[PDB]
Amino acid sequence: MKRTWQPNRRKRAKTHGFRARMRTPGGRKVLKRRRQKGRWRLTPAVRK
Amino acid sequence: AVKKFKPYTPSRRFMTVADFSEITKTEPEKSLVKPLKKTGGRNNQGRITVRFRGGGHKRLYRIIDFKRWDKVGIPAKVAAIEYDPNRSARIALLHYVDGEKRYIIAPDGLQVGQQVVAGPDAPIQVGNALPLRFIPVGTVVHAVELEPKKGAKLARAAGTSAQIQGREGDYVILRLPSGELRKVHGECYATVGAVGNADHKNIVLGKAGRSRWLGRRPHVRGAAMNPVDHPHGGGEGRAPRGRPPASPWGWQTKGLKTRKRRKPSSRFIIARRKK
RNA sequence: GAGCUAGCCCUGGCCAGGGUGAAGCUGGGGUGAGACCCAGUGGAGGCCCGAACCGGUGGGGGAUGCAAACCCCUCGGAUGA
RNA sequence: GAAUGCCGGCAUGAGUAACGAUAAAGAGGGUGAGAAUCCCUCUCGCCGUAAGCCCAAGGGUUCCUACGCAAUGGUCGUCAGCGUAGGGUUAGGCGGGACCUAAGGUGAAGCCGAAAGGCGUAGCCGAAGGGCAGCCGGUUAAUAUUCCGGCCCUUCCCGCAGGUGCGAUGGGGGGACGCUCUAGGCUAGGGGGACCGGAGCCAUGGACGAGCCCGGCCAGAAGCGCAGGGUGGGAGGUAGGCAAAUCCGCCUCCCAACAAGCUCUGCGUGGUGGGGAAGCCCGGGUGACAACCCCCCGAAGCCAGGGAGCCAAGAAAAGCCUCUAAGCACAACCUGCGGGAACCCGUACCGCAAACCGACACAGGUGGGCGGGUGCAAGAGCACUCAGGCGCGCGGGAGAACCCUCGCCAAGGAACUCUGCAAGUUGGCCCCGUAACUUCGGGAGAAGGGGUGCUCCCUGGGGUGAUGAGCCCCGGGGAGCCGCAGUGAACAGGCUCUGGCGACUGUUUACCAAAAACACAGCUCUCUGCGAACUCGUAAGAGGAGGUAUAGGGAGCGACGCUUGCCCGGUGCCGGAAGGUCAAGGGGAGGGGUGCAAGCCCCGAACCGAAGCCCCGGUGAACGGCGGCCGUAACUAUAACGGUCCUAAGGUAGCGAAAUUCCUUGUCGGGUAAGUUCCGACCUGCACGAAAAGCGUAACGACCGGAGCGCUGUCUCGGCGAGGGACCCGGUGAAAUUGAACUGGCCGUGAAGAUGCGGCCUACCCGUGGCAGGACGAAAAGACCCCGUGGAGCUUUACUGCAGCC
RNA sequence: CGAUGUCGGCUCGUCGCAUCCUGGGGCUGAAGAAGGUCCCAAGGGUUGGGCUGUUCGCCCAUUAAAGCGGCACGCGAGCUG
RNA sequence: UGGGAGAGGGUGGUGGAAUUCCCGGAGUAGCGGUGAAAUGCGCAGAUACCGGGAGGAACGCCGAUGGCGAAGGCAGCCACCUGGUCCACCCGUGACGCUGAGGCGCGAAAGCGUGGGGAGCAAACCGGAUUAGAUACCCGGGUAGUCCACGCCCUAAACG
RNA sequence: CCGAGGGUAGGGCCCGUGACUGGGGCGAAGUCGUAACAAGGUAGCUGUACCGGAAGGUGCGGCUGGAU
Ligand SMILES: [Mg+2]
Ligand SMILES: [Mg+2]
Ligand SMILES: [Mg+2]
Ligand SMILES: [Mg+2]
Ligand SMILES: [Mg+2]
Ligand SMILES: [Mg+2]
Ligand SMILES: [Mg+2]
Ligand SMILES: [Mg+2]
Ligand SMILES: [Mg+2]
Ligand SMILES: [Mg+2]
Ligand SMILES: [Mg+2]
Ligand SMILES: [Mg+2]
Ligand SMILES: [Mg+2]
Ligand SMILES: [Mg+2]
Ligand SMILES: [Mg+2]
Ligand SMILES: [Mg+2]
Ligand SMILES: [Mg+2]
Ligand SMILES: [Mg+2]
Ligand SMILES: [Mg+2]
Ligand SMILES: [Mg+2]
Ligand SMILES: [Mg+2]
Ligand SMILES: [Mg+2]
Ligand SMILES: [Mg+2]
Ligand SMILES: [Mg+2]
Ligand SMILES: [Mg+2]
Ligand SMILES: [Mg+2]
Ligand SMILES: [Mg+2]
Ligand SMILES: [Mg+2]
Ligand SMILES: [Mg+2]
Ligand SMILES: [Mg+2]
Ligand SMILES: [Mg+2]
Ligand SMILES: [Mg+2]
Ligand SMILES: [Mg+2]
Ligand SMILES: [Mg+2]
Ligand SMILES: [Mg+2]
Ligand SMILES: [Mg+2]
Ligand SMILES: [Mg+2]
Ligand SMILES: [Mg+2]
Ligand SMILES: [Mg+2]
Ligand SMILES: [Mg+2]
Ligand SMILES: [Mg+2]
Ligand SMILES: [Mg+2]
Ligand SMILES: [Mg+2]
Ligand SMILES: [Mg+2]
Ligand SMILES: [Mg+2]
Ligand SMILES: [Mg+2]
Ligand SMILES: [Mg+2]
Ligand SMILES: [Mg+2]
Ligand SMILES: [Mg+2]
Ligand SMILES: [Mg+2]
Ligand SMILES: [Mg+2]
Ligand SMILES: [Mg+2]
Ligand SMILES: [Mg+2]
Ligand SMILES: [Mg+2]
Ligand SMILES: [Mg+2]
Ligand SMILES: [Mg+2]
Ligand SMILES: [Mg+2]
Ligand SMILES: [Mg+2]
Ligand SMILES: [Mg+2]
Ligand SMILES: [Mg+2]
Ligand SMILES: [Mg+2]
Ligand SMILES: [Mg+2]
Ligand SMILES: [Mg+2]
Ligand SMILES: [Mg+2]
Ligand SMILES: [Mg+2]
Ligand SMILES: [Mg+2]
Ligand SMILES: [Mg+2]
Ligand SMILES: [Mg+2]
Ligand SMILES: [Mg+2]
Ligand SMILES: [Mg+2]
Ligand SMILES: [Mg+2]
Ligand SMILES: [Mg+2]
Ligand SMILES: [Mg+2]
Ligand SMILES: [Mg+2]
Ligand SMILES: [Mg+2]
Ligand SMILES: [Mg+2]
Ligand SMILES: [Mg+2]
Ligand SMILES: [Mg+2]
Ligand SMILES: [Mg+2]
Ligand SMILES: [Mg+2]
Ligand SMILES: [Mg+2]
Ligand SMILES: [Mg+2]
Ligand SMILES: [Mg+2]
Ligand SMILES: [Mg+2]
Ligand SMILES: [Mg+2]
Ligand SMILES: [Mg+2]
Ligand SMILES: [Mg+2]
Ligand SMILES: [Mg+2]
Ligand SMILES: [Mg+2]
Ligand SMILES: [Mg+2]
Ligand SMILES: [Mg+2]
Ligand SMILES: [Mg+2]
Ligand SMILES: [Mg+2]
Ligand SMILES: [Mg+2]
Ligand SMILES: [Mg+2]
Ligand SMILES: [Mg+2]
Ligand SMILES: [Mg+2]
Ligand SMILES: [Mg+2]
Ligand SMILES: [Mg+2]
Ligand SMILES: [Mg+2]
Ligand SMILES: [Mg+2]
Ligand SMILES: [Mg+2]
Ligand SMILES: [Mg+2]
Ligand SMILES: [Mg+2]
Ligand SMILES: [Mg+2]
Ligand SMILES: [Mg+2]
Ligand SMILES: [Mg+2]
Ligand SMILES: [Mg+2]
Ligand SMILES: [Mg+2]
Ligand SMILES: [Mg+2]
Ligand SMILES: [Mg+2]
Ligand SMILES: [Mg+2]
Ligand SMILES: [Mg+2]
Ligand SMILES: [Mg+2]
Ligand SMILES: [Mg+2]
Ligand SMILES: [Mg+2]
Ligand SMILES: [Mg+2]
Ligand SMILES: [Mg+2]
Ligand SMILES: [Mg+2]
Ligand SMILES: [Mg+2]
Ligand SMILES: [Mg+2]
Ligand SMILES: [Mg+2]
Ligand SMILES: [Mg+2]
Ligand SMILES: [Mg+2]
Ligand SMILES: [Mg+2]
Ligand SMILES: [Mg+2]
Ligand SMILES: [Mg+2]
Ligand SMILES: [Mg+2]
Ligand SMILES: [Mg+2]
Ligand SMILES: [Mg+2]
Ligand SMILES: [Mg+2]
Ligand SMILES: [Mg+2]
Ligand SMILES: [Mg+2]
Ligand SMILES: [Mg+2]
Ligand SMILES: [Mg+2]
Ligand SMILES: [Mg+2]
Ligand SMILES: [Mg+2]
Ligand SMILES: [Mg+2]
Ligand SMILES: [Mg+2]
Ligand SMILES: [Mg+2]
Ligand SMILES: [Mg+2]
Ligand SMILES: [Mg+2]
Ligand SMILES: [Mg+2]
Ligand SMILES: [Mg+2]
Ligand SMILES: [Mg+2]
Ligand SMILES: [Mg+2]
Ligand SMILES: [Mg+2]
Ligand SMILES: [Mg+2]
Ligand SMILES: [Mg+2]
Ligand SMILES: [Mg+2]
Ligand SMILES: [Mg+2]
Ligand SMILES: [Mg+2]
Ligand SMILES: [Mg+2]
Ligand SMILES: [Mg+2]
Ligand SMILES: [Mg+2]
Ligand SMILES: [Mg+2]
Ligand SMILES: [Mg+2]
Ligand SMILES: [Mg+2]
Ligand SMILES: [Mg+2]
Ligand SMILES: [Mg+2]
Ligand SMILES: [Mg+2]
Ligand SMILES: [Mg+2]
Ligand SMILES: [Mg+2]
Ligand SMILES: [Mg+2]
Ligand SMILES: [Mg+2]
Ligand SMILES: [Mg+2]
Ligand SMILES: [Mg+2]
Ligand SMILES: [Mg+2]
Ligand SMILES: [Mg+2]
Ligand SMILES: [Mg+2]
Ligand SMILES: [Mg+2]
Ligand SMILES: [Mg+2]
Ligand SMILES: [Mg+2]
Ligand SMILES: [Mg+2]
Ligand SMILES: [Mg+2]
Ligand SMILES: [Mg+2]
Ligand SMILES: [Mg+2]
Ligand SMILES: [Mg+2]
Ligand SMILES: [Mg+2]
Ligand SMILES: [Mg+2]
Ligand SMILES: [Mg+2]
Ligand SMILES: [Mg+2]
Ligand SMILES: [Mg+2]
Ligand SMILES: [Mg+2]
Ligand SMILES: [Mg+2]
Ligand SMILES: [Mg+2]
Ligand SMILES: [Mg+2]
Ligand SMILES: [Mg+2]
Ligand SMILES: [Mg+2]
Ligand SMILES: [Mg+2]
Ligand SMILES: [Mg+2]
Ligand SMILES: [Mg+2]
Ligand SMILES: [Mg+2]
Ligand SMILES: [Mg+2]
Ligand SMILES: [Mg+2]
Ligand SMILES: [Mg+2]
Ligand SMILES: [Mg+2]
Ligand SMILES: [Mg+2]
Ligand SMILES: [Mg+2]
Ligand SMILES: [Mg+2]
Ligand SMILES: [Mg+2]
Ligand SMILES: [Mg+2]
Ligand SMILES: [Mg+2]
Ligand SMILES: [Mg+2]
Ligand SMILES: [Mg+2]
Ligand SMILES: [Mg+2]
Ligand SMILES: [Mg+2]
Ligand SMILES: [Mg+2]
Ligand SMILES: [Mg+2]
Ligand SMILES: [Mg+2]
Ligand SMILES: [Mg+2]
Ligand SMILES: [Mg+2]
Ligand SMILES: [Mg+2]
Ligand SMILES: [Mg+2]
Ligand SMILES: [Mg+2]
Ligand SMILES: [Mg+2]
Ligand SMILES: [Mg+2]
Ligand SMILES: [Mg+2]
Ligand SMILES: [Mg+2]
Ligand SMILES: [Mg+2]
Ligand SMILES: [Mg+2]
Ligand SMILES: [Mg+2]
Ligand SMILES: [Mg+2]
Ligand SMILES: [Mg+2]
Ligand SMILES: [Mg+2]
Ligand SMILES: [Mg+2]
Ligand SMILES: [Mg+2]
Ligand SMILES: [Mg+2]
Ligand SMILES: [Mg+2]
Ligand SMILES: [Mg+2]
Ligand SMILES: [Mg+2]
Ligand SMILES: [Mg+2]
Ligand SMILES: [Mg+2]
Ligand SMILES: [Mg+2]
Ligand SMILES: [Mg+2]
Ligand SMILES: [Mg+2]
Ligand SMILES: [Mg+2]
Ligand SMILES: [Mg+2]
Ligand SMILES: [Mg+2]
Ligand SMILES: [Mg+2]
Ligand SMILES: [Mg+2]
Ligand SMILES: [Mg+2]
Ligand SMILES: [Mg+2]
Ligand SMILES: [Mg+2]
Ligand SMILES: [Mg+2]
Ligand SMILES: [Mg+2]
Ligand SMILES: [Mg+2]
Ligand SMILES: [Mg+2]
Ligand SMILES: [Mg+2]
Ligand SMILES: [Mg+2]
Ligand SMILES: [Mg+2]
Ligand SMILES: [Mg+2]
Ligand SMILES: [Mg+2]
Ligand SMILES: [Mg+2]
Ligand SMILES: [Mg+2]
Ligand SMILES: [Mg+2]
Ligand SMILES: [Mg+2]
Ligand SMILES: [Mg+2]
Ligand SMILES: [Mg+2]
Ligand SMILES: [Mg+2]
Ligand SMILES: [Mg+2]
Ligand SMILES: [Mg+2]
Ligand SMILES: [Mg+2]
Ligand SMILES: [Mg+2]
Ligand SMILES: [Mg+2]
């Protein structure tokens, strides 16, 4: 059938992108946490 | 005269459509339409706050001249009678001798080719807008302001009317379409005549489709739901209400009066409504 | 988290083909005028048959599957909610 | 040493199942260490509204080439979407940006919120919508509307010439719009040609032919030609388009109005630039100076912003035009010409799939365009085929049971069975004909029949053209021919009668329920006078609605027809300016503490004191409720009739052994050989009943019953046959499970059902194909049941709070 | 209770005998035929249908007869459901 | 041709009396009702009186034993639209007439549908009385409906 | 070819009969009430509507075939 993952570059960056995270308090804490843990990537890779 | 159809489908059996015998112009006035933005019953938080809304035909909003005290003593001609999908009434297009063009909602008996006028001096004739204090007692009237200069507010649905019962001070006594008696200020404007298209109540939507066309999504009985959804939820099988009939939200839907008791317009409601 | 799913909003798109043949219209009849009658034209419809498309009724298979819901035969809707 | 322990390692099942659509293969010749699997050829089969082609999204080098075969590939591998390396994506015109706005988002003004933050007009952002300038061919191993050739065009700058009141975010016009149906004329595409060009071919009995086979075009600037769209012209007045305004809007007059005039498109032609087959011979070359013409069909695309009808009434903004304001009229704009200038990003390749979503090269999912011919009424259906693309990444045998998918069947014909489940029957078309009932539409494809091929002959209309021929779409008549049989293959209804339930088309438990459930028009009650009620939110603010009682919220009922009875005592709701009860507060008889005293401090009775409750009313399509015993008629039986107890009132109409009836398969009737079901009745209704509606109701239904016809492998009752498996050989090689096992039967015994204990019987060791009685077989720490002072959803006149409202 | 799948059916049997039939008998209110009752006897046999989910039961038409029980109310790693 | 009478019909308008209701004042222990009662209503201020307002229907006197119409039937007043009818004059046509199966139209009340309306009245229904009972007559309430529009129904002691 | 007739399917008319149900007629001495005939103790009849064990009652409109 139709599965759950239907990639969509515009959707990916607009929902999980760096700018979507920076806007909201909970977004920044995300970026702060993943920085504290040391993630190589702070948001999903999406081609644009 | 509302039109019937032969029973050549189950739904055509009872379905009735308006006569449209009064419409003279079949496309609107481009200078007087806006995009009427459909909500779907969703507020600015995006929440369904009014239920069972959405999905109806696309519409343009016809700007309607609900003041008319803009243009005192300027005669306008009735150039057309047009279909408006935003209200039950029909609308009339006014070419003012000014050159200015406006829509008013069309009273009953109004004819393309005649002339209307707004102001304290206007003849007491169908389509003229006057302050309330100058309209003679007893004349039916529509498009009635409720507070001076705040815009026509009452008797704007098709077929409806208001009647000037008496005078008292700076106030006139109106029998609104609901049969209540209220005080409205005399400087409030009102328009001579009832609203046209009374046959509107006699329309039979004939099938569920036309309801969906009007933006009316299917209403679900509370009895049919589950208790997490509604006071009438559940039961094994069908079930009487088994408690005072309640809305989805708890309050009692039978009888329970709901107007504010301390509302300042109480000093101006003379009598609650009828039937 | 609404890239699944539910509903709505904005903007686009899709619906082979055949069948039935509403109103109206014209003529003709009828009449005091009407109603109504007949033929033709007309092409209405949550109309009819049926692909695409949308479904998922019955049965069989499948059952460490081709598949964590599939396959085959059958069947429902297919201009409309 | 056990924790269904944790991490790892390695066993068992086992050389077992399997190796992923039953579209299918065979051979020759290559290559190489090695070949069913790579390359080439010939033959065969498969898709062909796809299984071919072109976009989009997503993927991100996977593309092309050389070089490879450890791993990946379900086998093999010399091959590869794999490994190493090199190469490869070229734009003013294609798409996107330097343009436009949509929902939405954001957000100077502003508003609100303990903080975080929430709002919000403008404006900004935001696209597959609007706007905008490139078509044809050639070329690379791989990019091409991008490179190149040919012919076109756009904007910016600057110059020149001519013209003009120039000038904009300002004003206006325009952009600018639905649905069904649709004309005229074209184009896309297709069919035929006895005409035109072509390498040839003559077979196996005939044919040297009006024979066969192939092909007969594409793009094109201005002019012109055909077809369309858009479009009044002038004048005077003018108070409106938030300044202005010759524009626009409004009024008056002459004028031009099926016209035309102008302009804008499509189509054709068009200098010119290309293309060009089979076949033959190494993608090449030839063919070839290739020819490139005629007739027909003909779009759903184009002209287009076309026409008509309809109701549910069908975006915005920019471009573009027009108007003027500051300004400036040495400027500026317009037209024409010339030169110059013209940026960023994407472009490989896959793309119904082995490259995307599904952990897999996974029978699943994925939006748009093109989708050729013949025949079958039509069609994108079906069969077969073109172009093109494939044979599905294990094979070779054998020809058991059994399994799946499939074909047939003597006689019977539902006897099968929970049920004709399933499978038959029927099957398109044309014609004849067609019932109850009905809301007059329908029921209807009702039912049931006849026809259907081919040849010859005679003919009616329609389309093109010309009014003829030809082509072409519908027919009609007559005489015939063949077969078992002419929708000869493929696609393509079984019918009926009768109940129940729901009016109907719709909707639903994604992944066990499609239903009688939801919904539905329609009916009623109730709330709401607008800063509405109601909803969401702390609020601001939103929705409601830019709506106004013919409207909007809530609730039940559920088309329609005929209907909808009695009870307001209780609960609710509604009304009630009295009475009663009632908090804070007021009031202050009177006491209390303390101080030498003024004082300070405390307690405090009467009485005034809202809402709510009490009380008085109303109210049922508000929550609900609608009796018991005894007796009585001149056969009996039974009670129209009476007696009395109780109630707030004792169930009306209609219906009833029912989707409800317990006794129950009630009784009687019909159907049947036989009928716990069915239908029709009766009425002692355990326990129908009137908008949780009551009784009906045409039509509808993948709903649930009962009967009949047809026809059958469902059955008596099975038989044979087909292929895919199972089986055997070569290759790859899992799984749950598993205390260890050297694991028989009986009768006993044992924690009460023993391979394992006792006694007896039986039994050489080890396999293979099979079947399932046991291993209280396996997967699952029973979901039933109970227990836990475990949990959660839900309820209410349980308790206690809180939101909200008063 | 870290699961012993539960009605009925179908399929496949097998066992018991307190015997439905068939075979041998005694007694009889056994004349014959035909029965009744009891004794021996498990070898074999013990049908097809309508109703119901039914086991059962009732019925139809037959029959030599239309036996009754056990086998985890035999039998779902055999099917149905 | 010229006149006359008439509630003949249709539409729109509009006048006053009375009833109920609402509002203000004023006023108090009962009103109402019957054969007598009671239900009912009234100190939460009724009845009785004054002023005010809304709404409906029906039109007193005139009114008659009258008029009109085909019958059903039609009654405040105004205007519009329209039928019949009668009379005078003796002008016109020249038997054009009578009836009338069928057909068509009209047709009290009640009733039916869809809107509206709703004062008073009132089937049904409820209550109080009466009675052996009283599903009645009598009393207090009261829903259709009576009324408007359109469309049905087509009955009658539709009678002279 | 026509053709008695036979078969298949679907209609229309008629008759008989059917559990049960609807009223109707008639039947020496049943039960209930008293509706009508007098003002029949509510004048009565009437068309219609609703209602009630039954006769009847009530509403509406009409008739006199009504009385004083
Ligand atoms: Mg899905
Ligand atoms: Mg996944
Ligand atoms: Mg998707
Ligand atoms: Mg995207
Ligand atoms: Mg995108
Ligand atoms: Mg997106
Ligand atoms: Mg973002
Ligand atoms: Mg976001
Ligand atoms: Mg911070
Ligand atoms: Mg890093
Ligand atoms: Mg990571
Ligand atoms: Mg992140
Ligand atoms: Mg209709
Ligand atoms: Mg009709
Ligand atoms: Mg109209
Ligand atoms: Mg605009
Ligand atoms: Mg809005
Ligand atoms: Mg918003
Ligand atoms: Mg938001
Ligand atoms: Mg949110
Ligand atoms: Mg709501
Ligand atoms: Mg909504
Ligand atoms: Mg309108
Ligand atoms: Mg409205
Ligand atoms: Mg006011
Ligand atoms: Mg309505
Ligand atoms: Mg609408
Ligand atoms: Mg509903
Ligand atoms: Mg429910
Ligand atoms: Mg439920
Ligand atoms: Mg919830
Ligand atoms: Mg809750
Ligand atoms: Mg609740
Ligand atoms: Mg409930
Ligand atoms: Mg339920
Ligand atoms: Mg129940
Ligand atoms: Mg329920
Ligand atoms: Mg109820
Ligand atoms: Mg209850
Ligand atoms: Mg409640
Ligand atoms: Mg509330
Ligand atoms: Mg009111
Ligand atoms: Mg989130
Ligand atoms: Mg669309
Ligand atoms: Mg379609
Ligand atoms: Mg037809
Ligand atoms: Mg026709
Ligand atoms: Mg027409
Ligand atoms: Mg349809
Ligand atoms: Mg059909
Ligand atoms: Mg299925
Ligand atoms: Mg089947
Ligand atoms: Mg499964
Ligand atoms: Mg499938
Ligand atoms: Mg199929
Ligand atoms: Mg449908
Ligand atoms: Mg269909
Ligand atoms: Mg269709
Ligand atoms: Mg739609
Ligand atoms: Mg231990
Ligand atoms: Mg553990
Ligand atoms: Mg361990
Ligand atoms: Mg472990
Ligand atoms: Mg582990
Ligand atoms: Mg391990
Ligand atoms: Mg390790
Ligand atoms: Mg290992
Ligand atoms: Mg091994
Ligand atoms: Mg094995
Ligand atoms: Mg396996
Ligand atoms: Mg195998
Ligand atoms: Mg497999
Ligand atoms: Mg297949
Ligand atoms: Mg197959
Ligand atoms: Mg070969
Ligand atoms: Mg081979
Ligand atoms: Mg190989
Ligand atoms: Mg090899
Ligand atoms: Mg192969
Ligand atoms: Mg090869
Ligand atoms: Mg060969
Ligand atoms: Mg094809
Ligand atoms: Mg990938
Ligand atoms: Mg390898
Ligand atoms: Mg290898
Ligand atoms: Mg290597
Ligand atoms: Mg491998
Ligand atoms: Mg390998
Ligand atoms: Mg594989
Ligand atoms: Mg090699
Ligand atoms: Mg490349
Ligand atoms: Mg170019
Ligand atoms: Mg720049
Ligand atoms: Mg913060
Ligand atoms: Mg954005
Ligand atoms: Mg933008
Ligand atoms: Mg765009
Ligand atoms: Mg472009
Ligand atoms: Mg070009
Ligand atoms: Mg090209
Ligand atoms: Mg090269
Ligand atoms: Mg110059
Ligand atoms: Mg100029
Ligand atoms: Mg200018
Ligand atoms: Mg426009
Ligand atoms: Mg617009
Ligand atoms: Mg558009
Ligand atoms: Mg429409
Ligand atoms: Mg062309
Ligand atoms: Mg063709
Ligand atoms: Mg050309
Ligand atoms: Mg001028
Ligand atoms: Mg001016
Ligand atoms: Mg050459
Ligand atoms: Mg199309
Ligand atoms: Mg167009
Ligand atoms: Mg906008
Ligand atoms: Mg100046
Ligand atoms: Mg100058
Ligand atoms: Mg730049
Ligand atoms: Mg490219
Ligand atoms: Mg596919
Ligand atoms: Mg591929
Ligand atoms: Mg492909
Ligand atoms: Mg892959
Ligand atoms: Mg594969
Ligand atoms: Mg695949
Ligand atoms: Mg072709
Ligand atoms: Mg066909
Ligand atoms: Mg294959
Ligand atoms: Mg395939
Ligand atoms: Mg394979
Ligand atoms: Mg073998
Ligand atoms: Mg044969
Ligand atoms: Mg057979
Ligand atoms: Mg048979
Ligand atoms: Mg037969
Ligand atoms: Mg049967
Ligand atoms: Mg079943
Ligand atoms: Mg068949
Ligand atoms: Mg067929
Ligand atoms: Mg029949
Ligand atoms: Mg018929
Ligand atoms: Mg029938
Ligand atoms: Mg019927
Ligand atoms: Mg009919
Ligand atoms: Mg037929
Ligand atoms: Mg032949
Ligand atoms: Mg069919
Ligand atoms: Mg249904
Ligand atoms: Mg249902
Ligand atoms: Mg119904
Ligand atoms: Mg329904
Ligand atoms: Mg489900
Ligand atoms: Mg489920
Ligand atoms: Mg699930
Ligand atoms: Mg299912
Ligand atoms: Mg269900
Ligand atoms: Mg269904
Ligand atoms: Mg449902
Ligand atoms: Mg429902
Ligand atoms: Mg209804
Ligand atoms: Mg109502
Ligand atoms: Mg709230
Ligand atoms: Mg706060
Ligand atoms: Mg709004
Ligand atoms: Mg219904
Ligand atoms: Mg319901
Ligand atoms: Mg009560
Ligand atoms: Mg009460
Ligand atoms: Mg009460
Ligand atoms: Mg109080
Ligand atoms: Mg109760
Ligand atoms: Mg109860
Ligand atoms: Mg009743
Ligand atoms: Mg029963
Ligand atoms: Mg019964
Ligand atoms: Mg029965
Ligand atoms: Mg029943
Ligand atoms: Mg019951
Ligand atoms: Mg029973
Ligand atoms: Mg029985
Ligand atoms: Mg019988
Ligand atoms: Mg029955
Ligand atoms: Mg009985
Ligand atoms: Mg119920
Ligand atoms: Mg009820
Ligand atoms: Mg029924
Ligand atoms: Mg029915
Ligand atoms: Mg029916
Ligand atoms: Mg259905
Ligand atoms: Mg169904
Ligand atoms: Mg059945
Ligand atoms: Mg049957
Ligand atoms: Mg049969
Ligand atoms: Mg068989
Ligand atoms: Mg075989
Ligand atoms: Mg061997
Ligand atoms: Mg091997
Ligand atoms: Mg391997
Ligand atoms: Mg051991
Ligand atoms: Mg051992
Ligand atoms: Mg052993
Ligand atoms: Mg052994
Ligand atoms: Mg024991
Ligand atoms: Mg034992
Ligand atoms: Mg042993
Ligand atoms: Mg031992
Ligand atoms: Mg021992
Ligand atoms: Mg032993
Ligand atoms: Mg032993
Ligand atoms: Mg032994
Ligand atoms: Mg073996
Ligand atoms: Mg085996
Ligand atoms: Mg076993
Ligand atoms: Mg077994
Ligand atoms: Mg076992
Ligand atoms: Mg065990
Ligand atoms: Mg077992
Ligand atoms: Mg186990
Ligand atoms: Mg499990
Ligand atoms: Mg556990
Ligand atoms: Mg546990
Ligand atoms: Mg447990
Ligand atoms: Mg468990
Ligand atoms: Mg227990
Ligand atoms: Mg406790
Ligand atoms: Mg305890
Ligand atoms: Mg607990
Ligand atoms: Mg809890
Ligand atoms: Mg257990
Ligand atoms: Mg276990
Ligand atoms: Mg277990
Ligand atoms: Mg069987
Ligand atoms: Mg013997
Ligand atoms: Mg004897
Ligand atoms: Mg003897
Ligand atoms: Mg024996
Ligand atoms: Mg049985
Ligand atoms: Mg049993
Ligand atoms: Mg039984
Ligand atoms: Mg015998
Ligand atoms: Mg016998
Ligand atoms: Mg037994
Ligand atoms: Mg036992
Ligand atoms: Mg037992
Ligand atoms: Mg038992
Ligand atoms: Mg099983
Ligand atoms: Mg079983
Ligand atoms: Mg087992
Ligand atoms: Mg007092
Ligand atoms: Mg009123
Ligand atoms: Mg004379
Ligand atoms: Mg009448
Ligand atoms: Mg009447
Ligand atoms: Mg009483
Ligand atoms: Mg007495
Ligand atoms: Mg004959
Ligand atoms: Mg014969
Ligand atoms: Mg006596
Ligand atoms: Mg009487
Ligand atoms: Mg009497
Ligand atoms: Mg009398
Ligand atoms: Mg009397
Ligand atoms: Mg009465």
Side-chain angles (χ1 to χ4, degrees), chain B residues 112-124:
Chain B
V112 166
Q114 80 162 96
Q115 291 191 205
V116 293
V117 54
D121 301 318
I124 306 87

Side-chain angles (χ1 to χ4, degrees), chain B residues 92-131:
Chain B
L93 174 63
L94 304 193
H95 295 168
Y96 286 71
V97 295
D98 245 0
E100 191 157 10
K101 294 196 183 197
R102 288 177 176 188
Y103 280 136
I104 71 155
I105 87 184
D108 188 279
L110 190 79
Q111 292 300 343
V112 166
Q114 80 162 96
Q115 291 191 205
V116 293
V117 54
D121 301 318
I124 306 87
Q125 288 286 133
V126 169
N128 288 349
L130 300 73

Side-chain angles (χ1 to χ4, degrees), chain B residues 22-46:
Chain B
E22 301 302 324
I23 296 169
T24 70
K25 221 185 80 191
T26 199
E27 274 293 318
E29 184 63 21
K30 181 181 174 171
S31 119
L32 292 186
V33 288
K34 331 170 54 179
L36 213 188
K37 165 56 186 51
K38 290 198 303 184
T39 78
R42 274 84 159 168
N43 74 344
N44 62 340
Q45 309 153 337

